[PDB]
């Protein structure tokens, strides 16, 4: 259901989320316009996500329910797991550096992929079109 090539269309509250994550103003302004594109293929409970943005092009592979390591654009390391909760992908991560929870949720809403982040009580959404 998540399959295909998704290109970011708009954000909600993403600058405040980046600020909470400790990102400086220049990098927030870059991050607001990162041209994030996700190419997602699901095979059984296994996903491959090609992440392309102005910061980096990387390939992510994960299996539902299996812990993996993932590094953010500035090298900040996360560990966590994606699971399917109803029709939503729920990504439960923790920052290695401070142990704090970072959650990502992926959902289809109509013809859009809604990617929601939470960190320390601050929400952001990045909404993609296919
Ligand atoms: C270039 N630099 C310094 C950066 C610019 C803008 C935002 C940045 C964030 S951030 O936390 O504010 N935004 C990124 C959030 C990404 C959360 C990813 C969730 C886990 C994905 C797992 C793999 C997948 O399923 O695709 C973290 C670290 C560096 C950032």
CSV table of N, CA, C and O and ligand atoms in Angstrom, one decimal:
chain,number,residue,atom,x,y,z
A,1,UNK,N,0.9,-1.2,0.0
A,1,UNK,CA,0.0,0.0,0.0
A,1,UNK,C,0.9,1.3,0.0
A,1,UNK,O,0.5,2.3,-0.5
A,2,UNK,N,2.1,1.1,0.6
A,2,UNK,CA,3.0,2.2,0.7
A,2,UNK,C,3.9,2.3,-0.5
A,2,UNK,O,4.7,3.2,-0.7
A,3,UNK,N,3.8,1.3,-1.4
A,3,UNK,CA,4.7,1.1,-2.6
A,3,UNK,C,4.7,2.3,-3.5
A,3,UNK,O,3.6,2.9,-3.7
A,4,UNK,N,5.9,2.6,-4.0
A,4,UNK,CA,6.0,3.6,-5.1
A,4,UNK,C,6.9,4.7,-4.7
A,4,UNK,O,7.7,4.6,-3.8
A,5,UNK,N,6.9,5.8,-5.5
A,5,UNK,CA,7.9,6.9,-5.4
A,5,UNK,C,7.1,8.1,-4.9
A,5,UNK,O,6.2,8.5,-5.5
A,6,UNK,N,7.6,8.6,-3.7
A,6,UNK,CA,6.9,9.6,-3.0
A,6,UNK,C,7.7,10.9,-2.9
A,6,UNK,O,8.9,10.8,-2.5
A,7,UNK,N,7.2,12.0,-3.3
A,7,UNK,CA,7.9,13.2,-3.3
A,7,UNK,C,7.3,14.2,-2.4
A,7,UNK,O,6.1,14.4,-2.4
A,8,UNK,N,8.1,14.8,-1.5
A,8,UNK,CA,7.5,15.6,-0.5
A,8,UNK,C,6.8,16.8,-1.1
A,8,UNK,O,7.3,17.4,-2.1
A,9,UNK,N,5.6,17.1,-0.6
A,9,UNK,CA,4.7,18.2,-1.1
A,9,UNK,C,4.7,19.4,-0.2
A,9,UNK,O,4.7,20.5,-0.6
A,10,UNK,N,4.5,19.1,1.1
A,10,UNK,CA,4.4,20.2,2.1
A,10,UNK,C,4.7,19.6,3.5
A,10,UNK,O,4.6,18.4,3.7
A,11,UNK,N,5.0,20.6,4.4
A,11,UNK,CA,5.3,20.2,5.8
A,11,UNK,C,4.3,20.9,6.7
A,11,UNK,O,3.7,22.0,6.4
A,12,UNK,N,4.2,20.4,7.9
A,12,UNK,CA,3.5,21.0,9.0
A,12,UNK,C,4.4,20.9,10.2
A,12,UNK,O,4.8,19.9,10.6
A,13,UNK,N,4.7,22.1,10.7
A,13,UNK,CA,5.4,22.3,11.9
A,13,UNK,C,6.8,21.7,11.9
A,13,UNK,O,7.4,21.4,13.0
A,14,UNK,N,7.4,21.5,10.7
A,14,UNK,CA,8.7,20.8,10.6
A,14,UNK,C,9.8,21.7,11.1
A,14,UNK,O,10.8,21.2,11.8
A,15,UNK,N,9.8,23.0,11.0
A,15,UNK,CA,10.9,23.8,11.6
A,15,UNK,C,10.9,23.8,13.1
A,15,UNK,O,12.0,23.6,13.6
A,16,UNK,N,9.8,23.8,13.8
A,16,UNK,CA,9.8,23.7,15.2
A,16,UNK,C,10.3,22.3,15.6
A,16,UNK,O,11.0,22.2,16.6
A,17,UNK,N,9.9,21.2,14.9
A,17,UNK,CA,10.4,19.9,15.2
A,17,UNK,C,12.0,19.9,15.1
A,17,UNK,O,12.7,19.3,15.9
A,18,UNK,N,12.5,20.4,13.9
A,18,UNK,CA,13.9,20.4,13.8
A,18,UNK,C,14.6,21.2,14.9
A,18,UNK,O,15.7,20.8,15.4
A,19,UNK,N,14.1,22.3,15.3
A,19,UNK,CA,14.6,23.1,16.4
A,19,UNK,C,14.7,22.3,17.7
A,19,UNK,O,15.7,22.3,18.4
A,20,UNK,N,13.6,21.5,17.9
A,20,UNK,CA,13.6,20.7,19.1
A,20,UNK,C,14.7,19.6,19.0
A,20,UNK,O,15.3,19.2,20.1
A,21,UNK,N,14.9,19.1,17.8
A,21,UNK,CA,16.0,18.1,17.7
A,21,UNK,C,17.4,18.7,17.8
A,21,UNK,O,18.4,18.0,17.7
A,22,UNK,N,17.5,20.0,17.8
A,22,UNK,CA,18.8,20.7,18.0
A,22,UNK,C,19.4,21.2,16.8
A,22,UNK,O,20.6,21.5,16.8
A,23,UNK,N,18.7,21.2,15.7
A,23,UNK,CA,19.2,21.7,14.4
A,23,UNK,C,19.2,23.2,14.4
A,23,UNK,O,18.3,23.9,14.8
A,24,UNK,N,20.3,23.8,13.9
A,24,UNK,CA,20.5,25.2,13.8
A,24,UNK,C,19.7,25.9,12.7
A,24,UNK,O,19.2,25.2,11.9
A,25,UNK,N,19.6,27.2,12.7
A,25,UNK,CA,18.6,27.9,11.8
A,25,UNK,C,18.9,27.7,10.3
A,25,UNK,O,18.0,27.4,9.6
A,26,UNK,N,20.2,27.8,10.0
A,26,UNK,CA,20.6,27.5,8.5
A,26,UNK,C,20.1,26.1,8.1
A,26,UNK,O,19.5,26.0,7.1
A,27,UNK,N,20.5,25.1,8.9
A,27,UNK,CA,20.2,23.8,8.5
A,27,UNK,C,18.6,23.5,8.6
A,27,UNK,O,18.2,22.6,7.8
A,28,UNK,N,17.9,24.2,9.4
A,28,UNK,CA,16.4,24.1,9.4
A,28,UNK,C,15.9,24.6,8.1
A,28,UNK,O,15.0,24.0,7.5
A,29,UNK,N,16.4,25.8,7.7
A,29,UNK,CA,16.0,26.3,6.4
A,29,UNK,C,16.3,25.5,5.2
A,29,UNK,O,15.5,25.4,4.3
A,30,UNK,N,17.5,24.8,5.3
A,30,UNK,CA,17.8,23.8,4.3
A,30,UNK,C,16.9,22.6,4.4
A,30,UNK,O,16.4,22.1,3.4
A,31,UNK,N,16.6,22.1,5.6
A,31,UNK,CA,15.8,20.9,5.8
A,31,UNK,C,14.4,21.1,5.4
A,31,UNK,O,13.7,20.1,5.0
A,32,UNK,N,13.9,22.3,5.5
A,32,UNK,CA,12.5,22.7,5.0
A,32,UNK,C,12.3,22.5,3.5
A,32,UNK,O,11.2,22.3,3.1
A,33,UNK,N,13.4,22.5,2.8
A,33,UNK,CA,13.4,22.4,1.3
A,33,UNK,C,14.4,21.3,0.9
A,33,UNK,O,15.2,21.5,0.0
A,34,UNK,N,14.3,20.1,1.5
A,34,UNK,CA,15.3,19.1,1.3
A,34,UNK,C,15.0,18.2,0.1
A,34,UNK,O,15.8,17.3,-0.2
A,35,UNK,N,13.9,18.5,-0.6
A,35,UNK,CA,13.5,17.7,-1.8
A,35,UNK,C,13.4,16.2,-1.5
A,35,UNK,O,13.7,15.3,-2.3
A,36,UNK,N,13.0,15.9,-0.2
A,36,UNK,CA,13.0,14.5,0.2
A,36,UNK,C,12.1,13.6,-0.7
A,36,UNK,O,10.9,14.0,-1.0
A,37,UNK,N,12.7,12.5,-1.2
A,37,UNK,CA,11.9,11.6,-2.1
A,37,UNK,C,12.1,10.2,-1.5
A,37,UNK,O,13.2,9.8,-1.1
A,38,UNK,N,11.1,9.4,-1.3
A,38,UNK,CA,11.2,8.1,-0.8
A,38,UNK,C,10.7,7.1,-1.9
A,38,UNK,O,9.5,7.2,-2.3
A,39,UNK,N,11.5,6.2,-2.2
A,39,UNK,CA,11.1,5.1,-3.2
A,39,UNK,C,10.9,3.8,-2.3
A,39,UNK,O,12.0,3.3,-1.9
A,40,UNK,N,9.7,3.4,-2.1
A,40,UNK,CA,9.4,2.3,-1.2
A,40,UNK,C,8.9,1.1,-1.9
A,40,UNK,O,8.0,1.2,-2.8
A,41,UNK,N,9.5,0.0,-1.6
A,41,UNK,CA,9.0,-1.3,-2.1
A,41,UNK,C,8.9,-2.3,-0.9
A,41,UNK,O,9.8,-2.4,-0.1
A,42,UNK,N,7.7,-2.9,-0.8
A,42,UNK,CA,7.4,-3.9,0.2
A,42,UNK,C,7.4,-5.3,-0.4
A,42,UNK,O,6.7,-5.5,-1.4
A,43,UNK,N,8.1,-6.2,0.3
A,43,UNK,CA,8.1,-7.6,-0.1
A,43,UNK,C,7.9,-8.5,1.2
A,43,UNK,O,8.8,-8.7,2.0
A,44,UNK,N,6.6,-9.0,1.3
A,44,UNK,CA,6.2,-9.6,2.6
A,44,UNK,C,6.3,-8.6,3.7
A,44,UNK,O,5.7,-7.5,3.6
A,45,UNK,N,7.0,-8.9,4.7
A,45,UNK,CA,7.2,-7.9,5.8
A,45,UNK,C,8.5,-7.1,5.7
A,45,UNK,O,9.0,-6.6,6.7
A,46,UNK,N,9.0,-7.1,4.5
A,46,UNK,CA,10.3,-6.5,4.3
A,46,UNK,C,10.2,-5.3,3.4
A,46,UNK,O,9.5,-5.3,2.4
A,47,UNK,N,10.8,-4.2,3.8
A,47,UNK,CA,10.8,-3.0,3.0
A,47,UNK,C,12.2,-2.6,2.6
A,47,UNK,O,13.2,-2.8,3.3
A,48,UNK,N,12.2,-2.0,1.4
A,48,UNK,CA,13.4,-1.2,1.0
A,48,UNK,C,12.9,0.2,0.8
A,48,UNK,O,11.9,0.4,0.2
A,49,UNK,N,13.6,1.2,1.4
A,49,UNK,CA,13.3,2.6,1.2
A,49,UNK,C,14.5,3.3,0.6
A,49,UNK,O,15.6,3.3,1.3
A,50,UNK,N,14.4,3.8,-0.6
A,50,UNK,CA,15.5,4.6,-1.1
A,50,UNK,C,15.2,6.0,-0.7
A,50,UNK,O,14.2,6.6,-1.0
A,51,UNK,N,16.1,6.6,0.2
A,51,UNK,CA,15.9,7.9,0.7
A,51,UNK,C,16.8,8.9,-0.1
A,51,UNK,O,18.0,8.7,-0.2
A,52,UNK,N,16.2,9.8,-0.8
A,52,UNK,CA,17.0,10.8,-1.6
A,52,UNK,C,16.6,12.2,-1.1
A,52,UNK,O,15.4,12.5,-1.0
A,53,UNK,N,17.6,13.0,-0.8
A,53,UNK,CA,17.3,14.4,-0.5
A,53,UNK,C,18.6,15.2,-0.8
A,53,UNK,O,19.6,14.6,-1.2
A,54,UNK,N,18.5,16.5,-0.6
A,54,UNK,CA,19.7,17.3,-0.8
A,54,UNK,C,20.8,17.0,0.2
A,54,UNK,O,22.0,17.3,-0.1
A,55,UNK,N,20.5,16.3,1.3
A,55,UNK,CA,21.5,16.0,2.3
A,55,UNK,C,22.2,14.7,1.9
A,55,UNK,O,23.4,14.6,2.1
A,56,UNK,N,21.5,13.7,1.4
A,56,UNK,CA,22.1,12.4,1.1
A,56,UNK,C,21.1,11.5,0.3
A,56,UNK,O,19.9,11.7,0.4
A,57,UNK,N,21.7,10.6,-0.4
A,57,UNK,CA,21.0,9.5,-1.1
A,57,UNK,C,21.4,8.3,-0.4
A,57,UNK,O,22.6,7.9,-0.4
A,58,UNK,N,20.5,7.5,0.3
A,58,UNK,CA,20.9,6.3,1.0
A,58,UNK,C,19.8,5.3,0.8
A,58,UNK,O,18.6,5.6,0.5
A,59,UNK,N,20.1,4.0,0.9
A,59,UNK,CA,19.2,2.9,0.8
A,59,UNK,C,19.0,2.3,2.2
A,59,UNK,O,20.0,1.9,2.8
A,60,UNK,N,17.7,2.2,2.6
A,60,UNK,CA,17.4,1.7,3.9
A,60,UNK,C,16.7,0.3,3.7
A,60,UNK,O,15.8,0.3,2.8
A,61,UNK,N,17.0,-0.7,4.4
A,61,UNK,CA,16.3,-2.0,4.4
A,61,UNK,C,15.9,-2.3,5.8
A,61,UNK,O,16.8,-2.2,6.7
A,62,UNK,N,14.7,-2.7,6.0
A,62,UNK,CA,14.2,-3.2,7.3
A,62,UNK,C,13.2,-4.2,7.1
A,62,UNK,O,12.5,-4.3,6.1
A,63,UNK,N,13.0,-5.0,8.2
A,63,UNK,CA,12.0,-6.0,8.3
A,63,UNK,C,11.1,-5.6,9.5
A,63,UNK,O,11.6,-5.2,10.5
A,64,UNK,N,9.8,-5.7,9.3
A,64,UNK,CA,8.8,-5.4,10.3
A,64,UNK,C,9.2,-6.2,11.6
A,64,UNK,O,9.4,-7.4,11.6
A,65,UNK,N,9.2,-5.4,12.7
A,65,UNK,CA,9.5,-6.1,14.0
A,65,UNK,C,10.9,-6.3,14.4
A,65,UNK,O,11.2,-6.7,15.5
A,66,UNK,N,11.8,-6.0,13.4
A,66,UNK,CA,13.3,-6.3,13.7
A,66,UNK,C,14.0,-4.9,13.8
A,66,UNK,O,14.0,-4.1,13.0
A,67,UNK,N,14.7,-4.8,15.0
A,67,UNK,CA,15.5,-3.7,15.3
A,67,UNK,C,16.6,-3.4,14.3
A,67,UNK,O,17.3,-4.4,13.9
A,68,UNK,N,16.8,-2.2,13.9
A,68,UNK,CA,17.9,-1.8,13.0
A,68,UNK,C,18.5,-0.5,13.4
A,68,UNK,O,17.8,0.3,14.2
A,69,UNK,N,19.7,-0.1,12.9
A,69,UNK,CA,20.4,1.1,13.1
A,69,UNK,C,20.3,2.0,11.9
A,69,UNK,O,20.3,1.6,10.8
A,70,UNK,N,20.1,3.3,12.2
A,70,UNK,CA,19.9,4.3,11.1
A,70,UNK,C,20.5,5.6,11.5
A,70,UNK,O,20.3,6.0,12.6
A,71,UNK,N,21.2,6.3,10.6
A,71,UNK,CA,21.9,7.5,10.9
A,71,UNK,C,21.2,8.6,10.2
A,71,UNK,O,20.9,8.5,9.0
A,72,UNK,N,21.0,9.7,11.0
A,72,UNK,CA,20.3,10.9,10.4
A,72,UNK,C,21.4,11.7,9.6
A,72,UNK,O,22.5,11.4,9.6
A,73,UNK,N,20.9,12.8,9.0
A,73,UNK,CA,21.7,13.6,8.0
A,73,UNK,C,23.0,14.2,8.6
A,73,UNK,O,24.0,14.5,7.9
A,74,UNK,N,23.1,14.3,9.9
A,74,UNK,CA,24.2,14.9,10.6
A,74,UNK,C,25.0,13.8,11.3
A,74,UNK,O,25.9,14.2,12.1
A,75,UNK,N,24.7,12.5,11.1
A,75,UNK,CA,25.4,11.4,11.7
A,75,UNK,C,24.8,11.0,13.1
A,75,UNK,O,25.3,10.0,13.6
A,76,UNK,N,23.8,11.6,13.5
A,76,UNK,CA,23.1,11.2,14.8
A,76,UNK,C,22.5,9.9,14.5
A,76,UNK,O,21.7,9.7,13.6
A,77,UNK,N,22.8,8.9,15.4
A,77,UNK,CA,22.4,7.5,15.2
A,77,UNK,C,21.1,7.2,16.0
A,77,UNK,O,21.0,7.7,17.1
A,78,UNK,N,20.2,6.5,15.3
A,78,UNK,CA,19.0,6.0,15.9
A,78,UNK,C,19.1,4.5,15.9
A,78,UNK,O,19.7,3.9,15.0
A,79,UNK,N,18.4,3.8,16.8
A,79,UNK,CA,18.1,2.4,16.7
A,79,UNK,C,16.6,2.3,17.0
A,79,UNK,O,16.0,3.0,17.7
A,80,UNK,N,16.0,1.3,16.3
A,80,UNK,CA,14.5,1.2,16.4
A,80,UNK,C,13.9,0.2,15.5
A,80,UNK,O,14.6,-0.5,14.8
A,81,UNK,N,12.6,0.2,15.5
A,81,UNK,CA,11.8,-0.8,14.7
A,81,UNK,C,10.6,-0.2,14.1
A,81,UNK,O,10.0,0.7,14.7
A,82,UNK,N,10.3,-0.6,12.9
A,82,UNK,CA,9.0,-0.3,12.2
A,82,UNK,C,8.1,-1.5,12.5
A,82,UNK,O,8.6,-2.7,12.4
A,83,UNK,N,6.9,-1.3,12.8
A,83,UNK,CA,5.8,-2.3,12.9
A,83,UNK,C,4.6,-1.8,12.2
A,83,UNK,O,4.4,-0.6,12.0
A,84,UNK,N,3.7,-2.7,11.8
A,84,UNK,CA,2.4,-2.3,11.2
A,84,UNK,C,1.3,-2.3,12.2
A,84,UNK,O,1.0,-3.4,12.8
A,85,UNK,N,0.8,-1.1,12.5
A,85,UNK,CA,-0.3,-1.0,13.4
A,85,UNK,C,-1.6,-0.6,12.7
A,85,UNK,O,-1.7,0.6,12.3
A,86,UNK,N,-2.5,-1.5,12.6
A,86,UNK,CA,-3.6,-1.4,11.7
A,86,UNK,C,-3.1,-1.1,10.3
A,86,UNK,O,-2.2,-1.9,9.8
A,87,UNK,N,-3.5,-0.1,9.6
A,87,UNK,CA,-3.0,0.3,8.3
A,87,UNK,C,-1.8,1.3,8.3
A,87,UNK,O,-1.4,1.9,7.3
A,88,UNK,N,-1.3,1.6,9.5
A,88,UNK,CA,-0.2,2.6,9.7
A,88,UNK,C,1.2,1.9,10.0
A,88,UNK,O,1.2,0.9,10.7
A,89,UNK,N,2.2,2.5,9.4
A,89,UNK,CA,3.6,2.0,9.8
A,89,UNK,C,4.0,2.9,11.0
A,89,UNK,O,3.9,4.1,10.9
A,90,UNK,N,4.4,2.2,12.1
A,90,UNK,CA,4.8,3.0,13.3
A,90,UNK,C,6.3,2.7,13.5
A,90,UNK,O,6.7,1.5,13.7
A,91,UNK,N,7.1,3.7,13.5
A,91,UNK,CA,8.6,3.5,13.7
A,91,UNK,C,9.0,4.1,15.1
A,91,UNK,O,8.8,5.2,15.4
A,92,UNK,N,9.4,3.2,15.9
A,92,UNK,CA,9.7,3.5,17.3
A,92,UNK,C,11.2,3.5,17.4
A,92,UNK,O,11.9,2.4,17.4
A,93,UNK,N,11.8,4.7,17.5
A,93,UNK,CA,13.3,4.8,17.5
A,93,UNK,C,13.7,5.5,18.7
A,93,UNK,O,13.0,6.1,19.5
A,94,UNK,N,15.0,5.4,19.0
A,94,UNK,CA,15.7,6.1,20.1
A,94,UNK,C,17.0,6.7,19.6
A,94,UNK,O,17.7,6.0,18.9
A,95,UNK,N,17.2,7.9,20.0
A,95,UNK,CA,18.5,8.5,19.7
A,95,UNK,C,19.6,7.8,20.6
A,95,UNK,O,19.4,7.7,21.8
A,96,UNK,N,20.7,7.4,19.9
A,96,UNK,CA,21.8,6.7,20.7
A,96,UNK,C,22.5,7.7,21.6
A,96,UNK,O,22.8,7.3,22.7
A,97,UNK,N,22.6,8.9,21.2
A,97,UNK,CA,23.3,10.0,21.9
A,97,UNK,C,22.7,10.4,23.2
A,97,UNK,O,23.4,10.7,24.2
A,98,UNK,N,21.4,10.4,23.3
A,98,UNK,CA,20.7,10.8,24.5
A,98,UNK,C,19.6,9.9,25.0
A,98,UNK,O,19.0,10.1,26.1
A,99,UNK,N,19.3,8.9,24.3
A,99,UNK,CA,18.4,7.8,24.7
A,99,UNK,C,16.9,8.2,24.5
A,99,UNK,O,16.0,7.5,24.9
A,100,UNK,N,16.7,9.4,23.9
A,100,UNK,CA,15.3,9.9,23.8
A,100,UNK,C,14.6,9.3,22.6
A,100,UNK,O,15.2,9.1,21.6
A,101,UNK,N,13.3,9.2,22.7
A,101,UNK,CA,12.4,8.5,21.8
A,101,UNK,C,12.2,9.5,20.6
A,101,UNK,O,11.9,10.6,20.8
A,102,UNK,N,12.2,8.9,19.4
A,102,UNK,CA,11.8,9.7,18.2
A,102,UNK,C,10.9,8.7,17.5
A,102,UNK,O,11.3,7.5,17.2
A,103,UNK,N,9.7,9.1,17.2
A,103,UNK,CA,8.7,8.2,16.6
A,103,UNK,C,8.4,8.8,15.2
A,103,UNK,O,8.4,10.0,15.0
A,104,UNK,N,8.3,7.9,14.2
A,104,UNK,CA,7.7,8.2,12.9
A,104,UNK,C,6.6,7.4,12.6
A,104,UNK,O,6.6,6.2,12.9
A,105,UNK,N,5.5,8.0,12.1
A,105,UNK,CA,4.4,7.2,11.6
A,105,UNK,C,4.2,7.4,10.1
A,105,UNK,O,4.3,8.5,9.6
A,106,UNK,N,3.9,6.4,9.4
A,106,UNK,CA,3.5,6.5,8.0
A,106,UNK,C,2.1,6.0,7.7
A,106,UNK,O,1.7,4.9,8.2
A,107,UNK,N,1.3,6.9,7.1
A,107,UNK,CA,0.0,6.5,6.7
A,107,UNK,C,-0.4,7.0,5.4
A,107,UNK,O,0.1,8.0,4.9
A,108,UNK,N,-1.3,6.2,4.7
A,108,UNK,CA,-1.9,6.7,3.5
A,108,UNK,C,-3.2,7.4,3.8
A,108,UNK,O,-4.0,6.9,4.5
A,109,UNK,N,-3.3,8.6,3.3
A,109,UNK,CA,-4.5,9.4,3.5
A,109,UNK,C,-4.9,9.8,2.1
A,109,UNK,O,-4.3,10.7,1.5
A,110,UNK,N,-5.9,9.1,1.5
A,110,UNK,CA,-6.3,9.4,0.1
A,110,UNK,C,-5.2,9.0,-0.9
A,110,UNK,O,-4.8,7.9,-1.0
A,111,UNK,N,-4.7,10.0,-1.6
A,111,UNK,CA,-3.6,9.8,-2.5
A,111,UNK,C,-2.2,10.3,-2.0
A,111,UNK,O,-1.3,10.4,-2.7
A,112,UNK,N,-2.2,10.6,-0.7
A,112,UNK,CA,-1.0,11.2,-0.1
A,112,UNK,C,-0.4,10.2,1.0
A,112,UNK,O,-1.2,9.5,1.7
A,113,UNK,N,0.9,10.2,1.1
A,113,UNK,CA,1.6,9.5,2.2
A,113,UNK,C,1.9,10.6,3.3
A,113,UNK,O,2.5,11.6,3.0
A,114,UNK,N,1.4,10.4,4.5
A,114,UNK,CA,1.6,11.3,5.6
A,114,UNK,C,2.6,10.7,6.5
A,114,UNK,O,2.4,9.6,7.1
A,115,UNK,N,3.8,11.4,6.7
A,115,UNK,CA,4.8,10.9,7.5
A,115,UNK,C,4.9,11.9,8.7
A,115,UNK,O,5.2,13.1,8.5
A,116,UNK,N,4.5,11.4,9.9
A,116,UNK,CA,4.5,12.2,11.1
A,116,UNK,C,5.6,11.9,12.0
A,116,UNK,O,6.0,10.7,12.1
A,117,UNK,N,6.3,12.9,12.6
A,117,UNK,CA,7.3,12.7,13.5
A,117,UNK,C,6.9,13.2,14.9
A,117,UNK,O,6.2,14.2,14.9
A,118,UNK,N,7.4,12.5,15.9
A,118,UNK,CA,7.3,13.1,17.3
A,118,UNK,C,8.6,13.1,18.0
A,118,UNK,O,9.3,12.1,17.9
A,119,UNK,N,8.9,14.1,18.7
A,119,UNK,CA,10.1,14.1,19.5
A,119,UNK,C,9.9,15.1,20.7
A,119,UNK,O,9.6,16.3,20.4
A,120,UNK,N,10.0,14.6,21.9
A,120,UNK,CA,9.9,15.4,23.1
A,120,UNK,C,8.7,16.3,23.1
A,120,UNK,O,8.7,17.5,23.5
A,121,UNK,N,7.6,15.7,22.7
A,121,UNK,CA,6.3,16.5,22.7
A,121,UNK,C,6.0,17.4,21.5
A,121,UNK,O,5.0,18.1,21.6
A,122,UNK,N,6.9,17.4,20.5
A,122,UNK,CA,6.7,18.2,19.4
A,122,UNK,C,6.4,17.3,18.2
A,122,UNK,O,7.0,16.3,18.0
A,123,UNK,N,5.4,17.7,17.4
A,123,UNK,CA,4.9,17.0,16.2
A,123,UNK,C,5.3,17.7,14.9
A,123,UNK,O,5.3,18.9,14.9
A,124,UNK,N,5.6,16.9,13.9
A,124,UNK,CA,5.7,17.5,12.6
A,124,UNK,C,5.1,16.5,11.6
A,124,UNK,O,5.1,15.3,11.8
A,125,UNK,N,4.7,17.0,10.5
A,125,UNK,CA,4.3,16.1,9.4
A,125,UNK,C,5.0,16.6,8.1
A,125,UNK,O,5.2,17.8,7.8
A,126,UNK,N,5.3,15.6,7.3
A,126,UNK,CA,5.8,15.7,6.0
A,126,UNK,C,4.9,14.9,5.1
A,126,UNK,O,4.7,13.7,5.3
A,127,UNK,N,4.2,15.6,4.2
A,127,UNK,CA,3.2,15.0,3.4
A,127,UNK,C,3.7,14.9,1.9
A,127,UNK,O,4.2,15.8,1.3
A,128,UNK,N,3.6,13.6,1.4
A,128,UNK,CA,4.1,13.3,0.1
A,128,UNK,C,3.0,13.0,-0.9
A,128,UNK,O,1.9,12.6,-0.5
A,129,UNK,N,3.3,13.4,-2.2
A,129,UNK,CA,2.4,12.9,-3.3
A,129,UNK,C,3.2,11.9,-4.1
A,129,UNK,O,4.4,11.9,-4.1
A,130,UNK,N,2.5,11.0,-4.7
A,130,UNK,CA,3.1,10.0,-5.5
A,130,UNK,C,3.3,10.5,-7.0
A,130,UNK,O,3.4,11.7,-7.2
B,1,LIG,C1,21.6,18.2,7.7
B,1,LIG,N1,21.1,18.1,9.1
B,1,LIG,C2,21.9,18.6,10.1
B,1,LIG,C3,19.7,18.0,9.3
B,1,LIG,C4,18.8,18.8,8.7
B,1,LIG,C5,17.4,18.8,9.0
B,1,LIG,C6,16.9,18.0,9.9
B,1,LIG,C7,17.7,17.1,10.6
B,1,LIG,C8,17.1,16.1,11.6
B,1,LIG,S1,15.6,16.1,12.0
B,1,LIG,O1,15.4,15.1,13.0
B,1,LIG,O2,15.1,17.4,12.4
B,1,LIG,N2,14.7,15.6,10.8
B,1,LIG,C9,14.9,14.2,10.2
B,1,LIG,C10,13.9,13.2,10.9
B,1,LIG,C11,14.0,11.9,10.3
B,1,LIG,C12,13.4,10.8,11.2
B,1,LIG,C13,13.5,9.4,10.4
B,1,LIG,C14,12.7,8.3,11.0
B,1,LIG,C15,13.3,6.9,10.8
B,1,LIG,C16,13.5,6.5,9.4
B,1,LIG,C17,13.9,5.1,9.3
B,1,LIG,C18,14.2,4.6,7.8
B,1,LIG,C19,12.9,4.6,7.0
B,1,LIG,O3,12.0,3.8,7.3
B,1,LIG,O4,12.8,5.4,6.0
B,1,LIG,C20,18.1,15.3,12.3
B,1,LIG,C21,19.4,15.3,12.0
B,1,LIG,C22,20.0,16.2,11.1
B,1,LIG,C23,19.2,17.1,10.4
